[PDB]
Amino acid sequence: PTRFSKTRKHRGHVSAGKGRVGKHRKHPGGRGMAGGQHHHRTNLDKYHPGYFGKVGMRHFHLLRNHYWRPSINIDKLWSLVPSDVREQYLSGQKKDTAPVIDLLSHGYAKLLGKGRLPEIPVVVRARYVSAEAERKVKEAGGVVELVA
Amino acid sequence: AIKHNQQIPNNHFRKHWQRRVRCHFDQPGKKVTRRLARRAKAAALAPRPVDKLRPIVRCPTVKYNRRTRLGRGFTLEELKAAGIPRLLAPTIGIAVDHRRKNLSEESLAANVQRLKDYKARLILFPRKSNKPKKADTPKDQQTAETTTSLRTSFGVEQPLAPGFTEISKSEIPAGIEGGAYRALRKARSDARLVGVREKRAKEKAEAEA
RNA sequence: CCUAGUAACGGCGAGUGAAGCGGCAACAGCUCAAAUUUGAAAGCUGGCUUCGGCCCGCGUUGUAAUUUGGAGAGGAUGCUUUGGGCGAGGCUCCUUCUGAGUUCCCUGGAACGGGACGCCACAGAGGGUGAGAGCCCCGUAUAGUUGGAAGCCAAGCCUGUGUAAAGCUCCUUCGACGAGUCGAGUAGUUUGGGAAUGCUGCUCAAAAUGGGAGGUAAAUUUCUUCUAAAGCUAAAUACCGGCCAGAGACCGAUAGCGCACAAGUAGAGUGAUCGAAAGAUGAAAAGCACUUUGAAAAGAGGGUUAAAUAGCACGUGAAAUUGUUGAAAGGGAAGCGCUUGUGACCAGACUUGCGCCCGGCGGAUCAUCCGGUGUUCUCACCGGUGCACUCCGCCGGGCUCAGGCCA
RNA sequence: CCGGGACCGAGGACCGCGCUCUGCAAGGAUGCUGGCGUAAUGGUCACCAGCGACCCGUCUUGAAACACGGACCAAGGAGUCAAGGUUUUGCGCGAGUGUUUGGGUGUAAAACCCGCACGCGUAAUGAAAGUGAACGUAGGUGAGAGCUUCGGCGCAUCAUCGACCGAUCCUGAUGUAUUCGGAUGGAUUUGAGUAGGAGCGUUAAGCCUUGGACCCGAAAGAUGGUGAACUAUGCUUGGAUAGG
RNA sequence: AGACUAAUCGAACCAUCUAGUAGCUGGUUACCGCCGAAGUUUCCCUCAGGAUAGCAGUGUCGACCUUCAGUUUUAUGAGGU
RNA sequence: UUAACUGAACGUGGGCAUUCGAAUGUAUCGACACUAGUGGGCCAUUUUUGGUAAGCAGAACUGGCGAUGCGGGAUGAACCG
RNA sequence: GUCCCACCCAUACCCCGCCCUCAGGGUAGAAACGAUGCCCUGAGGAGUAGGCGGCCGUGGAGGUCAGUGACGAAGCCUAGGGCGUGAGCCCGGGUCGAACGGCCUCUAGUGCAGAUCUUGGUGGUAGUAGCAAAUACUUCAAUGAGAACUUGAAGGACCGAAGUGGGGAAAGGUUCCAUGUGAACAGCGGUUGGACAUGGGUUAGUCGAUCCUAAGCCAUAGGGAAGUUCCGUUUCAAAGGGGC
RNA sequence: GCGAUGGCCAGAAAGUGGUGUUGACGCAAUGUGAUUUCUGCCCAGUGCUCUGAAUGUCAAAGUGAAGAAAUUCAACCAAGC
RNA sequence: AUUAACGAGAUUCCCACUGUCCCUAUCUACUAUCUAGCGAAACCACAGCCAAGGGAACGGGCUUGGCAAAAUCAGCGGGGAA
RNA sequence: GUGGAAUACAAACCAUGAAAGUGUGGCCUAUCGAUCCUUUAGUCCCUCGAAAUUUGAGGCUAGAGGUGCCAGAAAAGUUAC
Ligand SMILES: [K+]
Ligand SMILES: [K+]
Ligand SMILES: [K+]
Ligand SMILES: [K+]
Ligand SMILES: [K+]
Ligand SMILES: [K+]
Ligand SMILES: [K+]
Ligand SMILES: [K+]
Ligand SMILES: [K+]
Ligand SMILES: [K+]
Ligand SMILES: [K+]
Ligand SMILES: [K+]
Ligand SMILES: [K+]
Ligand SMILES: [K+]
Ligand SMILES: [K+]
Ligand SMILES: [K+]
Ligand SMILES: [K+]
Ligand SMILES: [K+]
Ligand SMILES: [K+]
Ligand SMILES: [K+]
Ligand SMILES: [K+]
Ligand SMILES: [K+]
Ligand SMILES: [K+]
Ligand SMILES: [K+]
Ligand SMILES: [K+]
Ligand SMILES: [K+]
Ligand SMILES: [K+]
Ligand SMILES: [K+]
Ligand SMILES: [K+]
Ligand SMILES: [K+]
Ligand SMILES: [K+]
Ligand SMILES: [K+]
Ligand SMILES: [K+]
Ligand SMILES: [K+]
Ligand SMILES: [K+]
Ligand SMILES: [K+]
Ligand SMILES: [K+]
Ligand SMILES: [K+]
Ligand SMILES: [K+]
Ligand SMILES: [K+]
Ligand SMILES: [K+]
Ligand SMILES: [K+]
Ligand SMILES: [K+]
Ligand SMILES: [K+]
Ligand SMILES: [K+]
Ligand SMILES: [K+]
Ligand SMILES: [K+]
Ligand SMILES: [K+]
Ligand SMILES: [K+]
Ligand SMILES: [K+]
Ligand SMILES: [K+]
Ligand SMILES: [K+]
Ligand SMILES: [K+]
Ligand SMILES: [K+]
Ligand SMILES: [K+]
Ligand SMILES: [K+]
Ligand SMILES: [K+]
Ligand SMILES: [K+]
Ligand SMILES: [K+]
Ligand SMILES: [K+]
Ligand SMILES: [K+]
Ligand SMILES: [K+]
Ligand SMILES: [K+]
Ligand SMILES: [K+]
Ligand SMILES: [Mg+2]
Ligand SMILES: [Mg+2]
Ligand SMILES: [Mg+2]
Ligand SMILES: [Mg+2]
Ligand SMILES: [Mg+2]
Ligand SMILES: [Mg+2]
Ligand SMILES: [Mg+2]
Ligand SMILES: [Mg+2]
Ligand SMILES: [Mg+2]
Ligand SMILES: [Mg+2]
Ligand SMILES: [Mg+2]
Ligand SMILES: [Mg+2]
Ligand SMILES: [Mg+2]
Ligand SMILES: [Mg+2]
Ligand SMILES: [Mg+2]
Ligand SMILES: [Mg+2]
Ligand SMILES: [Mg+2]
Ligand SMILES: [Mg+2]
Ligand SMILES: [Mg+2]
Ligand SMILES: [Mg+2]
Ligand SMILES: [Mg+2]
Ligand SMILES: [Mg+2]
Ligand SMILES: [Mg+2]
Ligand SMILES: [Mg+2]
Ligand SMILES: [Mg+2]
Ligand SMILES: [Mg+2]
Ligand SMILES: [Mg+2]
Ligand SMILES: [Mg+2]
Ligand SMILES: [Mg+2]
Ligand SMILES: [Mg+2]
Ligand SMILES: [Mg+2]
Ligand SMILES: [Mg+2]
Ligand SMILES: [Mg+2]
Ligand SMILES: [Mg+2]
Ligand SMILES: [Mg+2]
Ligand SMILES: [Mg+2]
Ligand SMILES: [Mg+2]
Ligand SMILES: [Mg+2]
Ligand SMILES: [Mg+2]
Ligand SMILES: [Mg+2]
Ligand SMILES: [Mg+2]
Ligand SMILES: [Mg+2]
Ligand SMILES: [Mg+2]
Ligand SMILES: [Mg+2]
Ligand SMILES: [Mg+2]
Ligand SMILES: [Mg+2]
Ligand SMILES: [Mg+2]
Ligand SMILES: [Mg+2]
Ligand SMILES: [Mg+2]
Ligand SMILES: [Mg+2]
Ligand SMILES: [Mg+2]
Ligand SMILES: [Mg+2]
Ligand SMILES: [Mg+2]
Ligand SMILES: [Mg+2]
Ligand SMILES: [Mg+2]
Ligand SMILES: [Mg+2]
Ligand SMILES: [Mg+2]
Ligand SMILES: [Mg+2]
Ligand SMILES: [Mg+2]
Ligand SMILES: [Mg+2]
Ligand SMILES: [Mg+2]
Ligand SMILES: [Mg+2]
Ligand SMILES: [Mg+2]
Ligand SMILES: [Mg+2]
Ligand SMILES: [Mg+2]
Ligand SMILES: [Mg+2]
Ligand SMILES: [Mg+2]
Ligand SMILES: [Mg+2]
Ligand SMILES: [Mg+2]
Ligand SMILES: [Mg+2]
Ligand SMILES: [Mg+2]
Ligand SMILES: [Mg+2]
Ligand SMILES: [Mg+2]
Ligand SMILES: [Mg+2]
Ligand SMILES: [Mg+2]
Ligand SMILES: [Mg+2]
Ligand SMILES: [Mg+2]
Ligand SMILES: [Mg+2]
Ligand SMILES: [Mg+2]
Ligand SMILES: [Mg+2]
Ligand SMILES: [Mg+2]
Ligand SMILES: [Mg+2]
Ligand SMILES: [Mg+2]
Ligand SMILES: [Mg+2]
Ligand SMILES: [Mg+2]
Ligand SMILES: [Mg+2]
Ligand SMILES: [Mg+2]
Ligand SMILES: [Mg+2]
């Protein structure tokens, strides 16, 4: 809103807060990113180091669908089970069956392993798996299998 | 110029952009126009539904090939399996697509069942009401409760596979011999060396004799 | 909409920049060239015509039927499919008709204002009428109703019939498919397109499982996917230029379009072209009859009006600048700050209030108790009793206290 | 220890420290008396008198300047709007968050309802092929608000030594498509990392960039048109100039 | 004669691109309260201009952290005016 | 590291206010975030360079004017209070 | 030149009152409070460029005062009053004729002395500079409200046939003639007018145009050019007219 | 400088134009400036012009060799210098 | 390098001539000037007497002195850094 | 406290001296150069995105070709119109 502005407060005062010696002229210093290597180098080197030059090789016609593989840690593996069924397993009331989890149906491709796993056997299906993640699933009494 | 720690700006406003600006103040007005046209179209197709029957089809990339959706039309092989002539099909509300092919048995079986479900629910009125033909409904069944959507009555029942199930313990499978991680490393390694190994075997056999 | 300010281009500087997938709006498919009708050019423009055709002409250097790659042609095989005519009934357009106060009092030139009493309402949107009107007038709401024309859709009925033409299931064999075109080199331009994305000029110039593409130039071997060099086609999309209509937290005559007016006008320029200023008397002209002075323009009387402090030089009528009347100052500027004096003009404040005692006058019913009803459950109100040393009001006399300004 | 003058009276029941203690000069003025009750006190304006007083705006080290603009009055007249960033304030939900591209519906551009995809966040690091976060009660030491059974436990945050993931440089086990595979243990190396998540949407302000960009101002450049009624040169066809 | 080409010529006139760009001159509209500067460092075809550090304001948070100081004293170093 | 548990760094346990070990002040402790204006200066005591000298040109420490009125120097940005 | 008394006044120092700013305390078994209030205590106050806070005004929007008004809304004038440190707010008197305000939120084309600022209006200068080339006027009478510049007569003068004479071409367009007339125009006057109002006026077989060709311009046959169009005029063309 | 298949000049192009109804006593491009008397020396430099024996330099196309090919390497080589 | 004739081309001397000068005087017409009628413009922060001082180093305004009396007409070219 | 020269260690391989030791250019204070592009050395490593093998091209780490206006544009005069 226009009534909350320092413009309203400058009415009656010469120079509108811009100075009497320097005057708020049109474009002292160039337009845009002009002068990056000449008189704006002090700014461009304190912040944004690495701005000028080339690094790496090119890739013509990159298709992003070739590189789709979202990941999930073992830390949150049990949160993919519905809440009521999840509490029965944790409290120790099933003791005869095991859950089978489909990572792809939830939108994940690779299983990483970051945290800990409770000692209840589970069956996991995945496209990729980490070396540590497979160790922790097997040690809990489970098994992972590959599905494409 | 730049004076503090900023993100380097790139605003593409160096042409005469003010000549090409499209506001949308007619969004509610255009919505009313569309609803009037749908209502008029439904009245013209008096007992018929307002849509066409579509098949089930799977998406094409490594991303999205886990899901299914609706396609353009049924193939010529699917229509023949159900027993519907290709000239009759588009005149009773079925879409046809002549450039899709059945590379598998899974897709073929799914769509063949879809067609004969539709054929069982169909009511055919005779061309002349005083001379019905043996392929028409005998008019005692012409009265029933009908549907007029065909996109809600024949939609995609489940686009994704179930994400969770249960099996009895001691029925869990055994893993692959070396482990899942080692199997992936070996499959990758074989592909990178298929050309080297084939050349080595060939020159060995040729030099053998 | 998202992909995405991403892959990529760029004195790799300043800067630039798409596409496939995914969700939705809207959905609709087709016809030619290349084959011998060969047991019968089966095709078409024009003229004259009882209306049934006749005559010349076009055309075999190819007019119809048949086929278009999803196929198809040629054979088997036995089932199925089709033509005319009525038509209730409904939709669109024009047109006729629609509820309730001019009731009483005051102000006013005139109620459409204030007060009192009523009525209508699927109608209290808007406008007019001598000032703010639901009921004075036009309209506004609702489904109906009188009359007229042309189209569209459509429940269902009445009739022929296989000469012919059409769909489906199988098969040994056949299966025609667009050339100075594709492609290659080179030059220019362009693109995000990078040993070259598209287009065009010049030179060379094809093939039959052949040909194009598969985003890093080249040879060898595989694979995937389509089928160029001929053609048609509604909807979702753009636009206020043209003809209509409905609106707004927009502007209110130096604003809003250059133009609210005889405005693209008057006027300027040889010409192309340039281009203004300018809205408002009063409800009603009732727009001043007559007399008198003046050569006349006009003045003075006298009229109209609620008003001429509204007279067409017209609502209201500010400032700069000017006239008359009244007050005042002035020995080479004036204006201004602090502080007295003189003259002129002026706002407040004060006028009594509470209390005590004595006398007169009038009215009640003061305290207490009984019944009823509330409510904060112990405090009240109403009815009854009370009835002169109680309670309330007024007047007359005396006393204390408090009250304005300067010392 | 006694005299003489000047200016001032804030506060508003009691409470306190005290003294010369029937009371008082001790946490802030009362008592008595006169005149007048209105232009008398007081206020506004005009004028004379004493003292004081250079023309404003602006650039500038320095303006009253012999530095520029300004004869007078009325009306108009200049930091805005959009997209994209950022820090801070308020609000909703919270490992999630965002209805409004679209559909349903309506008293119809409002209000109300729906959910498939998608965006940002939940995981980093390398040019890339690729790989991918717990020795320990999620570690030890020094401070640390608060709590505490008084023995201690110790949030946020700061300093310090280590542990885990990716990259770089070394080492090279069991095995074997005998040339593949890369276990285990190290290194004055390196990352916008892990080590009991903080984010998504919206409201208001300052700042930044592209845009006409706070308002008015060049000498120039380009695209398309109109002039030889003046004047320059030429062509066709006409006219004019005493007397010695 | 750089002379003339409609009072216009060392490149006519008219409309449009066009609100052409300006490190340069001019202006930039009510009141009160509190705080309060710089003309210096480094880099730039930089010298009438910018970025960068300093000087200034505003919002806070941690404890109300035995915490600090343009100063004196005591002990102990360096210097070539 | 040393011939060597000999050293080097980091510590457990125990002891030491009968005084936490100069003066004065504390009228203002620490850390963070975002940003404005400025980047032409001039004068003076003492010390100083070039120049015959200058109301000239150039430096160091400190105080002033710029940005500031008031009492003195009759007047007088910078002098005395 | 040196020494000694008394005295004069700064916005500085000391004591008192009042304003604001900053800091520190008190206030609920609530007889309680614009708790955003009230009570108690101490210190401080200069300022350009610049930063922040609080307040006052203007045009519109939602809500609310069951607000004011033809018995007088809004606007305008007023050496008449009251409130506020201030921007401002409120009332009295006069003029006038149809609408307008207070409070809390929302919103913006929202506050002027300057820009040789834009449009319009108005001063001093000032009854001032001036109304002086082309030889020149005088008498009587008539008209008329009014005669130097209107008409008659009589005098005096100039142009002096390369004229201030009599006719035409270009250009203008009724300026030509008669009757009448308030204002405006004829830089003095005006009864007069090329001004203002109402009517009238241009007559061809023989004078011109019309006919012919000149310098030149443009069609047709053809050739260029993406095209608006450029060239070409007798050509590389099957191009006519005369009688019965 | 030029004998028409030409010299000088115009046009985007043209089955297009000017000199030109022309032909060296002509057309075109420059300097000096009546008559009289004269008009010396310099070809190194910059220009203009001529001659091809010169293989020195040397484009695209064409030819040869190597290679699986893209390609690379050689000779030959117009005008101009 | 010369050169007859020609030139509103530049320069030096001589004769005649004269108000160019010693050295200035006088006359005529039209103005100016006064009156009736008619009637502008440039320009303007506010204004309009000096001497010195200091000051942005040449004041109409400031400081210390000199002084200082209504309203006005014809001319003038010092200043208003006109 | 951003971008020539200098100091002290760590891990290797060496040179000298009997040895302790000394040696990371000249006894100390000067003697020099970014992005883009090209070229060489290094591993035998990654990619050419339908799949393989050989040529070719592209990346990753370290030097060299240079900006003397030396924190680094590619650049001749005149105006008396
Ligand atoms: K500012
Ligand atoms: K990655
Ligand atoms: K994507
Ligand atoms: K025929
Ligand atoms: K045919
Ligand atoms: K009908
Ligand atoms: K009446
Ligand atoms: K009445
Ligand atoms: K009434
Ligand atoms: K080509
Ligand atoms: K192929
Ligand atoms: K390819
Ligand atoms: K206008
Ligand atoms: K005209
Ligand atoms: K009335
Ligand atoms: K009257
Ligand atoms: K009136
Ligand atoms: K006090
Ligand atoms: K200035
Ligand atoms: K001035
Ligand atoms: K926020
Ligand atoms: K999501
Ligand atoms: K504690
Ligand atoms: K590491
Ligand atoms: K801006
Ligand atoms: K002639
Ligand atoms: K002209
Ligand atoms: K400059
Ligand atoms: K010395
Ligand atoms: K040891
Ligand atoms: K700064
Ligand atoms: K700065
Ligand atoms: K300076
Ligand atoms: K100086
Ligand atoms: K002084
Ligand atoms: K407002
Ligand atoms: K009044
Ligand atoms: K006059
Ligand atoms: K005369
Ligand atoms: K004459
Ligand atoms: K005739
Ligand atoms: K005749
Ligand atoms: K004619
Ligand atoms: K004729
Ligand atoms: K001719
Ligand atoms: K043509
Ligand atoms: K020729
Ligand atoms: K010559
Ligand atoms: K000459
Ligand atoms: K000659
Ligand atoms: K000569
Ligand atoms: K020579
Ligand atoms: K020579
Ligand atoms: K020569
Ligand atoms: K001459
Ligand atoms: K005069
Ligand atoms: K006169
Ligand atoms: K002086
Ligand atoms: K003074
Ligand atoms: K430089
Ligand atoms: K250097
Ligand atoms: K430099
Ligand atoms: K030049
Ligand atoms: K010169
Ligand atoms: Mg200020
Ligand atoms: Mg300024
Ligand atoms: Mg600045
Ligand atoms: Mg993104
Ligand atoms: Mg983008
Ligand atoms: Mg572009
Ligand atoms: Mg057929
Ligand atoms: Mg067949
Ligand atoms: Mg009616
Ligand atoms: Mg009305
Ligand atoms: Mg009405
Ligand atoms: Mg009524
Ligand atoms: Mg084809
Ligand atoms: Mg082009
Ligand atoms: Mg190209
Ligand atoms: Mg409208
Ligand atoms: Mg107007
Ligand atoms: Mg207008
Ligand atoms: Mg008017
Ligand atoms: Mg009258
Ligand atoms: Mg009136
Ligand atoms: Mg008037
Ligand atoms: Mg009026
Ligand atoms: Mg006035
Ligand atoms: Mg006076
Ligand atoms: Mg009673
Ligand atoms: Mg008191
Ligand atoms: Mg008294
Ligand atoms: Mg008085
Ligand atoms: Mg004075
Ligand atoms: Mg001066
Ligand atoms: Mg100037
Ligand atoms: Mg001026
Ligand atoms: Mg206005
Ligand atoms: Mg929508
Ligand atoms: Mg240019
Ligand atoms: Mg002419
Ligand atoms: Mg001219
Ligand atoms: Mg502008
Ligand atoms: Mg301009
Ligand atoms: Mg201060
Ligand atoms: Mg540079
Ligand atoms: Mg300047
Ligand atoms: Mg702390
Ligand atoms: Mg503290
Ligand atoms: Mg020394
Ligand atoms: Mg500057
Ligand atoms: Mg100096
Ligand atoms: Mg100087
Ligand atoms: Mg300054
Ligand atoms: Mg001072
Ligand atoms: Mg003084
Ligand atoms: Mg002195
Ligand atoms: Mg202050
Ligand atoms: Mg507005
Ligand atoms: Mg009024
Ligand atoms: Mg007044
Ligand atoms: Mg009216
Ligand atoms: Mg404005
Ligand atoms: Mg003004
Ligand atoms: Mg101003
Ligand atoms: Mg005069
Ligand atoms: Mg005259
Ligand atoms: Mg004259
Ligand atoms: Mg006369
Ligand atoms: Mg004569
Ligand atoms: Mg004569
Ligand atoms: Mg006449
Ligand atoms: Mg007449
Ligand atoms: Mg006149
Ligand atoms: Mg007259
Ligand atoms: Mg007259
Ligand atoms: Mg006339
Ligand atoms: Mg004739
Ligand atoms: Mg032509
Ligand atoms: Mg042609
Ligand atoms: Mg060659
Ligand atoms: Mg040669
Ligand atoms: Mg003087
Ligand atoms: Mg002097
Ligand atoms: Mg002056
Ligand atoms: Mg004086
Ligand atoms: Mg004079
Ligand atoms: Mg003068
Ligand atoms: Mg060593
Ligand atoms: Mg040596
Ligand atoms: Mg280098
Ligand atoms: Mg590829």
PDB file of N, CA, C and O (backbone and C1' of nucleotides) in Angstrom, chain E residues 6-17:
ATOM      1  P     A E   6      13.932  24.974 -51.763  1.00  0.00           P
ATOM      2  O5'   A E   6      13.041  26.289 -51.759  1.00  0.00           O
ATOM      3  C5'   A E   6      13.596  27.554 -51.418  1.00  0.00           C
ATOM      4  C4'   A E   6      12.524  28.573 -51.110  1.00  0.00           C
ATOM      5  C3'   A E   6      11.790  28.372 -49.790  1.00  0.00           C
ATOM      6  O3'   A E   6      11.427  29.639 -49.254  1.00  0.00           O
ATOM      7  C1'   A E   6      10.248  28.241 -51.576  1.00  0.00           C
ATOM      8  P     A E   7      11.698  29.967 -47.711  1.00  0.00           P
ATOM      9  O5'   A E   7      11.918  31.541 -47.677  1.00  0.00           O
ATOM     10  C5'   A E   7      13.051  32.131 -48.299  1.00  0.00           C
ATOM     11  C4'   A E   7      13.880  32.924 -47.321  1.00  0.00           C
ATOM     12  C3'   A E   7      14.342  32.161 -46.086  1.00  0.00           C
ATOM     13  O3'   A E   7      15.645  32.596 -45.708  1.00  0.00           O
ATOM     14  C1'   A E   7      12.977  34.000 -45.436  1.00  0.00           C
ATOM     15  P     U E   8      16.940  31.799 -46.224  1.00  0.00           P
ATOM     16  O5'   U E   8      16.761  30.326 -45.640  1.00  0.00           O
ATOM     17  C5'   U E   8      17.100  30.028 -44.294  1.00  0.00           C
ATOM     18  C4'   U E   8      17.046  28.549 -43.997  1.00  0.00           C
ATOM     19  C3'   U E   8      17.937  27.641 -44.826  1.00  0.00           C
ATOM     20  O3'   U E   8      19.275  27.641 -44.362  1.00  0.00           O
ATOM     21  C1'   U E   8      15.796  26.644 -44.458  1.00  0.00           C
ATOM     22  P     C E   9      20.442  28.365 -45.192  1.00  0.00           P
ATOM     23  O5'   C E   9      21.393  27.172 -45.635  1.00  0.00           O
ATOM     24  C5'   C E   9      22.129  26.420 -44.677  1.00  0.00           C
ATOM     25  C4'   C E   9      22.811  25.230 -45.306  1.00  0.00           C
ATOM     26  C3'   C E   9      23.760  25.551 -46.459  1.00  0.00           C
ATOM     27  O3'   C E   9      24.885  24.676 -46.413  1.00  0.00           O
ATOM     28  C1'   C E   9      22.086  24.055 -47.199  1.00  0.00           C
ATOM     29  P     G E  10      26.374  25.266 -46.521  1.00  0.00           P
ATOM     30  O5'   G E  10      27.309  23.992 -46.362  1.00  0.00           O
ATOM     31  C5'   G E  10      26.927  22.726 -46.888  1.00  0.00           C
ATOM     32  C4'   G E  10      27.670  21.600 -46.215  1.00  0.00           C
ATOM     33  C3'   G E  10      27.554  21.575 -44.696  1.00  0.00           C
ATOM     34  O3'   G E  10      27.548  20.226 -44.242  1.00  0.00           O
ATOM     35  C1'   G E  10      29.828  21.834 -45.318  1.00  0.00           C
ATOM     36  P     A E  11      26.199  19.580 -43.654  1.00  0.00           P
ATOM     37  O5'   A E  11      25.283  19.350 -44.929  1.00  0.00           O
ATOM     38  C5'   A E  11      24.134  20.158 -45.160  1.00  0.00           C
ATOM     39  C4'   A E  11      23.162  19.475 -46.087  1.00  0.00           C
ATOM     40  C3'   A E  11      22.406  18.299 -45.484  1.00  0.00           C
ATOM     41  O3'   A E  11      21.120  18.203 -46.098  1.00  0.00           O
ATOM     42  C1'   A E  11      23.743  17.539 -47.281  1.00  0.00           C
ATOM     43  P     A E  12      19.795  18.036 -45.205  1.00  0.00           P
ATOM     44  O5'   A E  12      18.717  18.968 -45.915  1.00  0.00           O
ATOM     45  C5'   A E  12      18.733  20.377 -45.746  1.00  0.00           C
ATOM     46  C4'   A E  12      17.519  21.019 -46.368  1.00  0.00           C
ATOM     47  C3'   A E  12      16.191  20.727 -45.693  1.00  0.00           C
ATOM     48  O3'   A E  12      15.966  21.570 -44.574  1.00  0.00           O
ATOM     49  C1'   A E  12      15.974  20.476 -48.040  1.00  0.00           C
ATOM     50  P     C E  13      15.320  21.001 -43.218  1.00  0.00           P
ATOM     51  O5'   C E  13      13.786  20.775 -43.573  1.00  0.00           O
ATOM     52  C5'   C E  13      12.923  21.865 -43.852  1.00  0.00           C
ATOM     53  C4'   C E  13      11.666  21.401 -44.537  1.00  0.00           C
ATOM     54  C3'   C E  13      10.825  20.397 -43.769  1.00  0.00           C
ATOM     55  O3'   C E  13       9.982  21.011 -42.812  1.00  0.00           O
ATOM     56  C1'   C E  13      11.089  19.668 -46.001  1.00  0.00           C
ATOM     57  P     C E  14       9.620  20.260 -41.443  1.00  0.00           P
ATOM     58  O5'   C E  14       8.683  19.060 -41.896  1.00  0.00           O
ATOM     59  C5'   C E  14       7.303  19.270 -42.128  1.00  0.00           C
ATOM     60  C4'   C E  14       6.611  18.008 -42.578  1.00  0.00           C
ATOM     61  C3'   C E  14       6.536  16.872 -41.573  1.00  0.00           C
ATOM     62  O3'   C E  14       5.512  17.061 -40.614  1.00  0.00           O
ATOM     63  C1'   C E  14       7.118  16.026 -43.703  1.00  0.00           C
ATOM     64  P     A E  15       5.750  16.689 -39.073  1.00  0.00           P
ATOM     65  O5'   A E  15       5.504  15.118 -39.008  1.00  0.00           O
ATOM     66  C5'   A E  15       4.191  14.588 -38.925  1.00  0.00           C
ATOM     67  C4'   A E  15       4.123  13.150 -39.384  1.00  0.00           C
ATOM     68  C3'   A E  15       4.757  12.102 -38.481  1.00  0.00           C
ATOM     69  O3'   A E  15       3.927  11.725 -37.398  1.00  0.00           O
ATOM     70  C1'   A E  15       5.410  11.718 -40.710  1.00  0.00           C
ATOM     71  P     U E  16       4.558  11.328 -35.975  1.00  0.00           P
ATOM     72  O5'   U E  16       5.215   9.893 -36.203  1.00  0.00           O
ATOM     73  C5'   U E  16       4.423   8.728 -36.380  1.00  0.00           C
ATOM     74  C4'   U E  16       5.251   7.559 -36.861  1.00  0.00           C
ATOM     75  C3'   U E  16       6.340   7.060 -35.919  1.00  0.00           C
ATOM     76  O3'   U E  16       5.852   6.194 -34.910  1.00  0.00           O
ATOM     77  C1'   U E  16       7.236   7.303 -38.082  1.00  0.00           C
ATOM     78  P     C E  17       6.620   6.053 -33.506  1.00  0.00           P
ATOM     79  O5'   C E  17       7.959   5.263 -33.853  1.00  0.00           O
ATOM     80  C5'   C E  17       7.940   3.883 -34.184  1.00  0.00           C
ATOM     81  C4'   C E  17       9.327   3.348 -34.446  1.00  0.00           C
ATOM     82  C3'   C E  17      10.332   3.489 -33.317  1.00  0.00           C
ATOM     83  O3'   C E  17      10.167   2.505 -32.311  1.00  0.00           O
ATOM     84  C1'   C E  17      11.340   4.118 -35.359  1.00  0.00           C
TER      85        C E  17
END
